[PDB]
Symmetry: C5
Subunit: 98 residues, 5 copies
């Protein structure tokens, strides 16, 4: 389950906590309309991973992609802090769990 730290951090924002997601697809797309990085869960939930050109968010977003692709490759769960009502929702924080 999300650490208490990760829960509390997400609770102080308007984004929503999503716990124990199994991500099963990892997507890179450069098509004009859908240019971005996305993940899909075992039940078809789709999320876009945040991106940032500059330091220091270019580091946190690169680490978001690493977390996302390790979850897909290794079958580990993630907890997410992201939009609740859209599709795709965007990820603003992500927790990889062992």
């Amino acid at each position: 389950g999300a650490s208490q730290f990760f829960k509390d951090n997400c609770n102080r924002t308007t984004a929503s906590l999503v716990e124990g997601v199994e991500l099963t697809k990892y997507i890179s797309d450069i098509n004009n309309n859908t240019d971005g990085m996305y993940v899909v869960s075992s039940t078809g939930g789709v999320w876009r991973i945040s991106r940032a050109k500059d330091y220091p968010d270019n580091v946190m977003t690169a680490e978001m992609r690493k977390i996302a692709m390790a979850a897909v490759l290794d079958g580990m769960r993630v907890n997410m802090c992201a939009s609740p009502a859209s599709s795709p929702n965007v990820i603003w924080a992500i927790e990889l769990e062992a």
Copy 2:
């Protein structure tokens, strides 16, 4: 099978979807006529991976190479959205499947 999101995204473009591809070779080549990154499937299909110098497609294209390489290393399938306008066809989107 490709996620619904990935198929919808490819359907908005001039490219074609290829599903459940087993990639068995990953190539890097700096020869004058043959400069690029490529993948080869179990069936003999050949695709060129897109590249991009600048933000933000420098991000997506780096992840396309990670996805390609992981598919070869781990034996995971990929779904591609690939343009027939060149030869090898150029990957415009790729989905790694757990």
Copy 3:
């Protein structure tokens, strides 16, 4: 157990030595108040990973993250040199143990 080398170095600073930590969560966050990379241990300690934009510490901090994330993926223990001056405590050196 921490190397003597690693202990002695941390003893040159105001930080404390934390040994044999099992990290089980790896977090990337870009929300405004909690922008950063973090780890959580099996007993619920939380640390922030240092960051740096420029050479040479851009290298050292990129490896701290690699270390932290391999620890979470693979269950290896880490030793930390972590300052207790802030919450969460900031990692200033880390040692991955095979």
Copy 4:
């Protein structure tokens, strides 16, 4: 076996094709006279991996290193297209085979 694509591409050059090579050493060296990345095979052949500062061969040469290390780490074979104009011969293209 090398893909027909990889083989045709190498045949367009003055370089030589070397197929099914087992790499057993991956070397980084910054000594004055041998400054470079090299690989050694099971039969004692040695090759120097290409490098490039500028886009887009900075991408291709990075992926060549990733391929050579993965080969060493995971015992996968490679096919190389290597120029005998210097010694160690230089890798102008490399194909990782699953």
Copy 5:
């Protein structure tokens, strides 16, 4: 053992050849007095990994880190060519063995 090539490149003794090393600790440290990347062997030896800001040695020193990291994670042996001019000795070349 070390490849003949790696041996011959270290030789001349201005530097020290260390063969068959098992690395069991990998260290990142940003404290100013001891800022660097280091490794610790099973016998308790400690080395500093070289660093470099500019091309092309920024590539080799990045690969030295990867090799050091892989040795610790995976238990692979390395051979080193290190300078006895300082303590810890500085790795000027490293060979990862399959």
